[PDB]
Design a protein around this ligand. Structure first.
Ligand SMILES: Cc1cc2nc3c(=O)[nH]c(=O)nc-3n(C[C@H](O)[C@H](O)[C@H](O)COP(=O)(O)OP(=O)(O)OC[C@H]3O[C@@H](n4cnc5c(N)ncnc54)[C@H](O)[C@@H]3O)c2cc1C
Length: 634
């Protein structure tokens, strides 16, 4: 599975041609299947050669010399496959030693707005393709939403921190190229209630199980029964979850009522059987030849005692049924008050991963990209994720503290206007043939706008911008000079007191003596209005309740993100809002033409299968580089 592995690691089926390939190789698709098999092998083998050694450029010549007979004889097919893989960034992407040209002459000028991972990835491709490219970045650093805090021996990521599995992840290649150290995240996450006591194992698993059944029930309601619209409004995941919970509570109350009726019935029978027994005793009373009269009262009294003694047995078969029934009552409630708070911790955790309250997520599409998840454990970046954007910036023409304010594009070229953010007096004007916009969705949604488009973007584009969600989440970095927590535990949770505030500092994690506290959901935007000192104080109180007031010292350093207030972000990353879908991600990727595409788009919000991630941003950049090169360089 070597060549089979290369296709998989490249997100491609090893045994068939993708739609994109069919388009580029119409003669292969509509030809001898035997040729397709040769195409797929050359493609898979070329990807393998690249994947086995991504720190060095894989040339056409070298691909040909390493292919085996007969493949090494079809020079022309190999060239076409290598050119295709290269143009689209499946090989020779990221950071690697070139071993050939980098023509001193440059064809075409492209301006790239934003120097985040998508802009950086696209730039390296475009430059290696021989175009003249310049990146305009508003901040005084590269990386965008990859933002690493570094002081002394302290390292912590305020932006992206997790590599979500290596299997199929292009970040696996990049990780090798920049030598970024990755470490698995242990899953064990003990939970502590608001009073500091740990949630027992049995309870933990019970609630988690319900969390899972609840989500599965909404998935069933949505994709099997199609209940995605109600009162002419798209249903949200949070809305559906609350209804499923209501049904559970109704069911519990129903079974409770039936059990009470069983009790009351049994009680009524006992009461009645008792009354007839009392009346029979009274009959036995009254009832209480001479020789014959004796035998006669005998058969009479014994007939009434064959009646009464028996009545006492059917009575014992009732007092038995009763006492059982009320020893085996059904559940009193679906979720106890505490149980619900623990369930809210799992919802808070989901709001964290999705960067938004559950009531804003599309029930039908929120998890639209699951089928593309990578395989493998999730890893964290020991030395800080900024090592990637920093290494990708090597050798590019990047203009920092340069905030773009207007993008003008015509059938003859474009102009990008920006201003120095250190001296808002001077305004630069950069002319070019094409503009690649990597501005965050949050910035594109800004009202009044942060950057004007002349002409204004089409309605089909802006309405997509408006429908799509742009979430938020924050982190508080607590640097200590000591480790007072369990070092064999990477994560531990804090169960809040209310549903509304379930996302407040609900999670803590480590890996130096550093703890990060996470703020999710509704709490994420609200907490940004609290000073660092006060938020830090709330963290310590929580930690003190867990570990003990004397075990928790004051932090040496703290850093608090406020992604929604950050003007260059306006949030953390997108999410499929109620009323949107995977299609808006495609609409966001569509280039704008004045009869030749001039304005292009990349960014995590323009890639349908991998949104809201660093790998998605990277792939979107590789994608646009290819589309732009195809237009200008042929
Ligand atoms: C808190 C947080 C946690 C996250 N965790 C993870 C994670 O664990 N794993 C994962 O894979 N992803 C994670 N993500 C998402 C991931 O970081 C992003 O999807 C990705 O980095 C986006 O890259 P981008 O190039 O699309 O956008 P950006 O990185 O935002 O790049 C856009 C650039 O445009 C610049 N800019 C803005 N306005 C202007 C202007 N007017 N003129 C010029 N420049 C401008 C911005 O400064 C920025 O540099 C997280 C994001 C956040 C914020």
């Amino acid at each position: 599975s070597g060549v089979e592995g290369a296709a998989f690691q490249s997100r491609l089926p090893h045994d068939r041609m993708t739609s994109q390939e069919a388009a580029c190789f119409p003669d292969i698709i509509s030809g001898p299947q035997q040729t397709q098999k040769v195409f797929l092998f050359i493609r898979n083998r070329t990807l393998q050669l690249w994947l086995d050694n991504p720190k060095i450029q894989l040339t056409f010549e070298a691909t040909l010399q390493q292919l085996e007979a007969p493949y090494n004889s079809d020079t022309v097919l190999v060239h076409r496959v290598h050119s295709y893989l290269e143009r689209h960034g499946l090989i020779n992407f990221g950071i690697y030693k070139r071993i050939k040209p980098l023509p001193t002459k440059k064809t075409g000028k492209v301006i790239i707005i934003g120097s985040g991972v998508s802009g950086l990835a696209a730039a390296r491709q475009l430059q290696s393709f021989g175009m003249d490219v310049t990146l305009l970045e508003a901040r005084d650093r590269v990386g965008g939403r990859v933002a690493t805090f570094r002081k002394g021996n302290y390292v912590a990521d305020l932006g992206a921190m997790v590599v979500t599995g290596l299997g199929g992840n292009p970040m696996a290649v990049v990780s090798k190229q920049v030598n970024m150290e990755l470490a698995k995240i242990k899953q064990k996450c003990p939970l502590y209630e608001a009073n500091g006591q740990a949630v027992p194992k049995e309870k933990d698993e019970m609630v988690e199980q319900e969390f899972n059944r609840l989500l599965e029930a909404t998935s069933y309601l949505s994709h099997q029964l199609d209940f995605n619209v109600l009162n002419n409004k798209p249903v949200s995941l949070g809305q559906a979850l609350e209804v499923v919970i209501q049904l559970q509570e109704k069911h519990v109350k129903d079974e409770q009522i039936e059990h009470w009726k069983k009790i009351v019935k049994t009680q009524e029978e006992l009461k009645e059987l008792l009354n007839k027994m009392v009346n029979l005793k009274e009959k036995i009373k009254e009832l209480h030849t001479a020789e014959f009269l004796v035998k006669s009262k005998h058969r009479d009294l014994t007939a009434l005692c064959k009646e009464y003694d028996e009545l006492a047995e059917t009575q014992g078969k009732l007092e038995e049924k009763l006492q059982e029934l009320e020893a085996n009552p059904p559940s009193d409630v679906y979720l106890s008050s505490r149980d619900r708070q623990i369930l809210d911790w799992h919802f808070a955790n989901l709001e964290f991963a999705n960067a938004t309250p559950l009531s804003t997520l599309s029930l039908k599409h929120w998890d639209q990209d699951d089928d593309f998840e990578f395989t493998g454990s999730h890893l964290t970046v020991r030395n800080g994720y900024s090592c990637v954007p920093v290494a990708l910036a090597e050798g590019l023409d990047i203009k920092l503290n340069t905030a773009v304010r207007q993008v003008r594009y015509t059938a003859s070229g474009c102009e990008v206007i920006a201003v120095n953010t250190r001296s808002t007096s001077q305004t630069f004007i950069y002319k070019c043939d094409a503009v690649l916009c990597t501005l965050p969705l949050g910035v594109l949604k800004q009202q009044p706008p942060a950057v004007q488009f002349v002409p204004p973007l089409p309605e089909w584009k802006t309405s997509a911008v408006q429908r799509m969600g742009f979430g938020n989440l924050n982190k508080v970095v607590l640097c200590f000079d000591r480790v007072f927590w369990d070092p064999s535990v990477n994560l531990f949770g804090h169960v809040g007191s209310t549903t509304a505030s379930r996302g407040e500092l609900f999670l803590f994690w480590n890996l130096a003596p550093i703890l990060l506290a996470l703020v999710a959901g509704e709490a994420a935007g609200i907490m940004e209005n609290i000073s660092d000192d006060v938020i830090v104080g709330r963290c310590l109180a929580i930690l003190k309740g867990i570990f003990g007031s004397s075990a928790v010292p004051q932090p040496k350093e703290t850093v608090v993100s406020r992604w929604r207030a950050d003007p260059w972000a306006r949030g953390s990353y997108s999410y499929v809002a109620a009323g949107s879908s995977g299609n808006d991600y495609d609409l966001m990727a569509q280039p704008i033409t004045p009869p030749i595409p001039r304005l292009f788009f990349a960014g995590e919000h323009t890639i349908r299968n991998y949104p809201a991630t660093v790998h998605g941003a990277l792939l979107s950049g590789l994608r646009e580089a290819g589309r732009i090169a195809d237009q200008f360089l042929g």
